[PDB]
A paper describes a structure:
Nitrogenase catalyzes the ATP-dependent reduction of dinitrogen to ammonia during the process of biological nitrogen fixation that is essential for sustaining life. The Fe-protein mediates ATP-dependent electron transfer (ET) through its [4Fe:4S] cluster to the intermediate [8Fe:7S] P-cluster in the MoFe-protein; the electrons are subsequently shuttled to a [7Fe:1Mo:9S:1C]-R-homocitrate metallocluster, the FeMo-cofactor, within the active site of the MoFe-protein. The active site FeMo-cofactor contains a [7Fe:1Mo:9S:1C] metallocluster coordinated with an R-homocitrate (HCA) molecule.
Indeed, the determination of intact MoFe-protein structures required either surfactants or the use of carbon-layered grids, due to the localization of MoFeAs-isolated to the air AWI, causing strong orientation bias, and disorder of its α-subunit. The use of cryo-electron-tomography (cryoET) was crucial for the validation of the MoFe-protein grid and freezing conditions. Optimized vitrification of the as-isolated MoFe-protein alone (MoFeAs-isolated) yielded a 2.13 Å resolution structure in the presence of detergent.
Residue numbers in the entry:
A (entry chain C), D (entry chain A): 4 to 480
B (entry chain D), C (entry chain B): 2 to 523
């Protein structure tokens, strides 16, 4: 499809909306022109969703509890409020970790205050203090507590910061109040920002006066890698083969101590800009730690990122980087030789959260695959600025796409594969279009690094070329 | 490293030596992990009776609950009506979570919209959200009906759904004749089943309250069937099948079986099947209304008995032999239709399976959990099978339900060692299975974690999980099973006996150690 | 010792210290057992490729066969006719074994008689046995029909069944009009499925051969269905259900579903249901005859095509998506009935489940065995699911069937690493799963022993068994399953994917070792 | 009921038979009169079955391969002939053993010559020799081979004795030809006798000239205990607590070496008289070893048997016997106290093979249970002589009962429980009568000894008092 056909498709899809919704939604759909750079020109993002249009967006609690704080393994995260929010987010995200669950790690557990009517009417501060006492009694090896606010907490006037301060002083424990009520912001993104501010205010500066950490000039911290299916581990190994010492992982398989040790590193390697640029900029301002974005999706991006990271260090790190690249060249070359012939020319449409809609493009192009449509749930204008150069000409860009919009776009564009979340998977599987979960990796992965690239190619091939897709039409129809 | 011809996913890729060394370096350098002996000591402590005593003293902390919030049940109830859009007035994160939860259980699309109430609506209400959301939803997804529930944010700020919808119709956002039933579903009251009950009552009231003058009880020769919160498609199907076998005219109100089982034939069907508005309007003309899950259909029962004037029978959930028999006899009495020979044959076949499997089922100890009606039906069937329920947990149960279940247990010698817990979560149950070990658990997917914990104590301490209930996330297509009627009883019996036999086969597979009992014939 | 509160059966009673000490004393004093290191060495040797090369050089020894003898199939076929007594002329030990085998598989009564030929009959023949046996059986059990097969003793002796039965009727032992169909079923030819084929051909010949003059093809507007040797009640039921949904008139010849599923209601029914003599007599008037399992219905096909003049369609067993589609389209063409919307919806739901589970099913390696038609249907369905059949074993298969299965494998890229074995037993398959390890086995209960063997090599070498086929002795009520049609395909799909997921859960249950991949959602 | 009613019931049941079958079957049904203990007066047994009457009897191959030879664990047993007989008998009998299956033990495996048409026409001796070679190649740790003849072997003129002799001489291997063709005899009993003769002729005298076994005055062998569900083990422990050394077990968990060592024992303890009295009498005649029958079913019989066995030895064995009885008294007394109140007065009908119809009566009476009917598949007149004193007055005795006969007897008598085989279980379960498998112990057990008595009482109670038996009639009927 040419640019004119994409604009016409956008207009026909928008036709059914009421006038106000049509006017709003027109700002969130665009045809990519990599000849320009500004997102103040084509796509408006980070706005509120139109009511009743089946947005795929989550809330700030999902962005804070489910994304940033939840993966921190040795901390206990209290879903403060009614039972639902904690129950629906329990173990739904594959932020992998090593630990003894219920003893020293608590990632897949659901801790909640389980608000009843009396907690709504008379407040929940005393219940929160009692809850913290009970947590201390029953989980003595927890290294800290976070209190993730659900919607009612901010509406009933509860003061979780005072309880956090008093209980933390009394128990000599880090207790982090997070005001991530779901009605704040417009998506998970404000949850990211609130969680980052909570880290900055309650955890990050714990060891500011401490100087007993033996630091090396090769100290780095992986920021914004949540170890989905082991992704961070598949990244970390490469960074440690390059001669770097990864001091912290934020926050997949992350501990509170390594978060506290982050201000001691020489470099902050930021994978997910969207969720962690706030703390990266803060650490740059306060501790003078530079941060750089990197991409470990596919061999081309991984090699570029490894070289760019090694260029921040001495010649020994650069030599080790070349050694790692030489070591892994045959592996990913074999992966390409095996899977690119079966994926050449296949067209993909992506709809993911804040980072992956542009980050995984390089891996698809490494497999000979073309991304004809991409979009974000909750990205900001800077993410679209980054996306414009990563995306091909006359390709479709969508922000906060409605279910109707996405289904119509797929009906017209007819991609060979769709990469998106669980709420679109079965819709597009029923239309006979191969679908890949690009949040959970369809319970596969990791996809980061070379080891992840092998799995990514295998998964894309197994879903796109599955025999089932040829059997949706009955032979008598 | 990866071999291109044998690619490893996370398991067992991270068991490789290089990954093991890297993880050990991470742990020893930066995690500041507690020493492994301390971790083992704390785990052993958590398996003990002293820890259980501390655990059951909890008053404010809930750990791993077995329940959801009301709007989930409201959405599931709304999904059972023809061309009906579930509409949750409030915050969009709730709808995202509801849809993901139901998607993972059913492996099907789940359509539900939010009016995306933000911080400004938290000050002056979500009236504008309601108007724009109703208009946008009707224009875009073209439902015949929009069924409105609430998130906790809308409940806390006191949004008046009735006034908001009336103002939406008054100002032309939606037609005055368009059906917009509503229910208040506060997440801090009850659970998801309570939300189902509230939503169904709201819909029934919307369609019948103002038109009762021309209604005559029994005028349409049908029986109303209210299933309640149900996540097995087989249960809807088996109720319909048994009623059709008897020749009993019936109206299954809130039937989501079709929309949760759409075929994959090249097109996406947002709506499929469901209770029609005509059926709900004609419902007061039925001979009676039968509540399949009466312990979370109390508000519906009050409305049906007080407005429709239906003498709702005192029936347990038709689970297991005795309660299926009672259900069929009551339906036969209400409709006048005799119980047919096919249903008698099916009951006899269930009894034959019970006699075939009783030696393996007898005396087996089960810890189980789930929703109240489902749990008591399972307890009744286990007692019929000569099994011993030991730990009966219902997080969303109440004192009256506990009294009824205790009465059921007292009627059987196999309920002697049974304790019923209400308001307890799965951390409590983990303590219970560590301190008073049963043979098996029966529950949803969350119990898998308990199994892991028990296995960590030792193989002889491991309590295997049997996945019956909601939600089931780590197995495929179990939502197609049946738990009601003779067919559901047969499925449950087969699951239980073959779980027992699979465990025995695992325990006797050790060559020259335990394989003397690795019998071909069981 | 026994604690009265917790009584131990053999497992784990013999794991107690006193029993262990006594067994060790027995072994060390009197068993003269080979040293344990020698036993380990020999076991490891049996796991290797050199042992497999020696294994596949066998010419005279058979170890753990995957087949039975003809009279078993003859008895199963005879059980499918109304009020019919299976009567095996020959030795009584055979009948005792047949009855025990079918009792253990079906967990139901199996009625069959012998004429108890003894050593004297080895010189004079079993004529007196036949006369007395037919008279006694008719008098005592009052069948409407006696269907006669043979044991190997009668076949080697040379007993002429036709002459024996004719003499029995000539001398007044049984009425001349009493139906006594017969078949020669030598156990040293073919297998149990061949016995089914012979018995069915004998019955069809008995009822139709002499009365073909007034027969007109297609006069009764029905389709004959010959199921063949079938041990899943669900398969009979699903064929009947699909044909009824199409509105297709059908005659299921040899239908044993009722007599193998009698209810437990206080009385024993020796006979129940079954193909009536009138149906068999009217069978040549059908539009056509469809053979559900053509690879062991060759004699029946020859008779039906040569005598009834039915143009038997070239149809595979209706197993899996493509072959169920082909079966339904052929039935639609023969009967003139369109395929209804319900069957289209069912097919679409099967496709939905396939898409839901393909990521877990893709690339999984299966060894499998069973009867020819069943095995090729399973291979076809596995290829449809993106699975890799690697070791395909059929002890009772032939060169032509192997050619057909190789053609099926060649049509799919998922059949590249597939080998078909005919005439090989389960010791051969043990070697194959040790040397070229698959992910799973699919077969009957005998495969459990292979699983044990593999586990003895190591947990990482263990090949779990999936019980689909005949016989299944160590699980209960699996004979109620379905393997045919879309329903059978859904059951098989669910079994396979959940077996995979159960294995993954077992492998990832190790706390702080492999539980990083112990995902709630799969 | 009274004796007259039982005779009347017998006559009414018999009236359906044709005249010849009626005349024969009248001789196999009797009403017990324990005052008169002659089986030449009341019941006729060990006759051929009437054709077409659904006998429960097996064949001589089942009696030899399935019963006597099969349990011998370190031997490989070839089912010589077509595939059926070996396949149907594979692992159908729970003769428990310890060993590594397929390496040094072969009980649950099915070795067969799998006769085809050419083997029938041209013989199978060469195939048998080739098969023995292949057995030697693939199972080098086997300590002997037996060749169990199926029906065709004796009809086609095959000479398995010559092959056995030649191959045994060539391989220095014990190769035992067993002429247990199913058409021989009338039941499993002749299979017992043929297997016993084979043991006597080919195995038992192996170490006649060998005197390197260190023998003690307390040397005993257990003969005719096939370790069903571990029964023999549950017996053996008691005998070893009494100070005796059990040298051999025939043949459950039995090895060939311990069979060869049996002629060195001081006493032969015969449990199953029916299957092993031949070899017991032979060992008495040749080696002068006395043999005695014993019963380990239930505490009363077990205590009596232990005292009778200890009376054959010195005072130390008798003192140890009293110690064993004192040690086990509280356990079986607790079993009785728990289960007899729930089983008092319950009426049982039994139909089993050659020993158990009379041997288990003591355990039932120990539980307060009354056996009102009993009978045998293949017992001889001596077994009925032993049964007459074990059975109550006016109780029903049946030999080679037909299915119709047993069903009618059960309909009239209406026992509370039936103990029989797999071919009667589901028939009587469908009539609403609790059933216990008295061959396989319903995949439970052991039932021998005190440890077995606990399991026996638990099983009888769990089946007789199961709730399911109250639920067969639908409430609307
Ligand atoms: S944190 Fe963000 S929606 Fe950067 S909230 Fe979301 S585990 Fe997505 S595109 Mo789920 S900004 Fe991570 C994300 Fe990306 S949960 Fe994961 S996949 S790279
Ligand atoms: S050997 Fe006999 S039929 Fe004595 S052939 Fe049979 S394992 Fe029975 S009554 Mo099955 S003479 Fe043993 C017997 Fe008794 S197989 Fe077992 S239970 S004590
Ligand atoms: Fe049964
Ligand atoms: Fe689906």
């Amino acid at each position: 499809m040419s640019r004119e056909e994409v604009e016409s498709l956008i207009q026909e899809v928008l036709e059914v909306y009421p006038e106000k919704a049509r006017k709003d939604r027109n700002k969130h759909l665009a045809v990519n022109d990599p000849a320009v750079t500004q997102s103040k020109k084509c796509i408006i993002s980070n706005k509120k969703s139109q009511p009743g249009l089946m947005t795929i967006r989550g809330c700030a609690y999902a962005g804070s509890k489910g994304v940033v704080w939840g993966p921190i393994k040795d901390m206990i995260h209290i879903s403060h409020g009614p039972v639902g929010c904690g129950q629906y987010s329990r173990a739904g995200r594959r932020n992998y970790y090593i630990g003894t669950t219920g003893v020293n790690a608590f990632v897949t557990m659901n801790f909640t205050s389980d608000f009843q009517e009396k907690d709504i009417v008379f407040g929940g501060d005393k219940k929160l203090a009692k809850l913290i006492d009970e947590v201390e009694t029953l989980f003595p090896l927890n290294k800290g507590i976070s209190v993730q606010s659900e919607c009612p907490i901010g509406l009933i006037g509860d003061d979780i910061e005072s309880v956090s301060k008093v209980k933390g002083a009394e128990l000599s424990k880090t207790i982090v109040p997070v005001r991530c009520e779901g009605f704040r912001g417009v998506s998970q993104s404000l949850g990211h920002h609130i969680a980052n501010d909570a880290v900055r205010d309650w955890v990050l500066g714990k060891r500011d006066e401490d100087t007993t950490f033996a630091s090396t000039p090769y100290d780095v911290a992986i920021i914004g890698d949540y170890n989905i299916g082991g992704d961070a581990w598949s990244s970390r190994i490469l960074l440690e083969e390059m001669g770097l010492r990864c001091v912290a992982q934020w926050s997949g398989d992350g501990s509170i101590s390594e978060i506290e040790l982050t201000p001691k590193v020489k470099l902050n390697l930021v994978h997910c800009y969207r969720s962690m640029n706030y703390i990266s900029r803060h650490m740059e301002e306060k501790y003078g730690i530079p941060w750089m974005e990197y991409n470990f999706f596919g061999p081309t991006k991984t090699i570029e990122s490894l070289r760019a990271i090694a260029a921040k260090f001495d010649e020994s790190i650069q030599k080790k980087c070349e050694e790692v690249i030489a070591k892994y060249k045959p592996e990913w070359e074999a992966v390409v030789a095996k899977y690119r012939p079966r994926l050449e020319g296949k067209r993909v449409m992506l709809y993911i959260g804040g980072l992956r809609p542009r980050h995984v493009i390089g891996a698809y192009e490494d497999l000979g695959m073309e991304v004809v449509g991409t979009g974000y749930e909750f990205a900001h204008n800077d993410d679209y600025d980054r996306t414009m150069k990563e995306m091909g000409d006359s390709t479709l860009l969508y922000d906060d796409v409605t279910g109707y919009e996405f289904e119509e776009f797929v009906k017209r564009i007819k991609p060979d594969l769709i990469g998106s979340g669980i709420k679109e998977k079965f819709i597009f599987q029923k239309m006979g279009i191969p679908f890949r979960e690009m949040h959970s990796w369809d319970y596969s992965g990791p996809y980061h690094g070379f080891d992840g690239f092998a799995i990514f190619a295998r998964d894309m091939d197994m879903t796109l070329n599955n025999p089932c897709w040829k059997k949706l039409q009955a032979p008598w129809e | 490293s990866q071999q291109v011809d044998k690619i490893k996913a996370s398991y067992p890729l991270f068991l490789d030596q290089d990954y093991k060394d890297m993880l050990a370096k991470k742990r020893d350098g930066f995690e500041e992990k507690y020493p492994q002996d301390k971790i083992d000591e704390v785990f052993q402590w958590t398996t003990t009776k002293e820890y259980q005593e501390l655990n059951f003293q909890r008053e404010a902390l809930t750990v791993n609950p077995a329940k959801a919030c009301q709007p989930l049940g409201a959405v599931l109830c709304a999904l059972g009506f023809e061309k009906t859009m579930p509409y949750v007035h409030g915050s969009q994160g709730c709808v995202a979570y509801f849809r993901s939860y139901f998607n993972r259980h059913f492996r099907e699309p789940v359509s539900c919209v939010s009016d995306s109430m933000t911080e400004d609506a938290a000050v002056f209400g979500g009236q504008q959200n309601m108007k724009d959301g109703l208009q946008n939803c009707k224009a875009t997804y073209k439902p015949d009906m929009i069924a409105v529930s609430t998130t906790c944010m809308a409940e806390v700020i006191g949004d008046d759904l009735n006034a908001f919808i009336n103002n939406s119709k008054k100002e032309g956002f939606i037609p005055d004749e368009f059906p917009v039933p509503f229910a208040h579903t506060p997440s801090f009251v009850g659970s998801h089943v309570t939300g189902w009950d509230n939503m169904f009552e709201g819909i029934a009231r919307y369609f019948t309250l103002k038109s009762m003058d021309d209604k005559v009880v029994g005028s349409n020769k049908k029986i109303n069937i209210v299933p309640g919160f149900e996540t097995y498609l087989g249960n809807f199907r088996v109720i319909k099948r048994m009623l059709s076998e008897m020749g009993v005219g019936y109206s299954l109100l809130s039937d989501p079986e079709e929309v949760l089982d759409t075929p994959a034939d090249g097109q996406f069907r947002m709506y499929a099947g469901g209770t029609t508005q005509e059926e709900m309007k004609d419902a007061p003309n039925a001979l009676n209304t039968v509540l399949l899950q009466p312990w979370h259909l109390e508000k519906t029962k009050k409305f049906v008995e007080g407005t429709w004037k239906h003498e709702v029978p005192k029936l347990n959930i038709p689970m297991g032999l005795d309660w299926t028999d009672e259900f069929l006899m009551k339906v036969s009495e209400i409709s006048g239709q005799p119980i047919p020979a096919s249903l008698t044959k099916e009951r006899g076949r269930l009894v034959d399976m019970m006699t075939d499997s009783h030696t393996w089922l007898h005396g087996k100890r089960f810890a189980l959990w789930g929703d109240p009606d489902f749990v008591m039906g399972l307890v009744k069937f286990l007692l019929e099978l000569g099994c011993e329920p030991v730990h009966i947990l219902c997080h969303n149960g109440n004192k009256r339900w506990k009294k009824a279940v205790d009465a059921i247990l007292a009627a059987s010698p196999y309920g002697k060692n049974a304790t019923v817990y209400i308001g307890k979560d799965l951390w409590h149950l983990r303590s219970l299975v560590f301190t008073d070990k049963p043979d098996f658990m029966i529950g949803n997917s969350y119990g898998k974690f308990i199994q892991r914990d028990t296995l960590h104590k030792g193989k002889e301490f491991e309590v295997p999980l049997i996945r019956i209930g909601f939600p089931i996330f780590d197995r495929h297509h179990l939502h197609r099973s049946t738990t009601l009627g003779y067919e559901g009883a047969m499925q449950i019996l087969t699951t239980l006996v073959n779980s027992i036999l699979e465990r025995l086969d695992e325990e006797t597979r050790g060559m020259q150690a335990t394989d003397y009992n690795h019998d071909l014939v069981r």
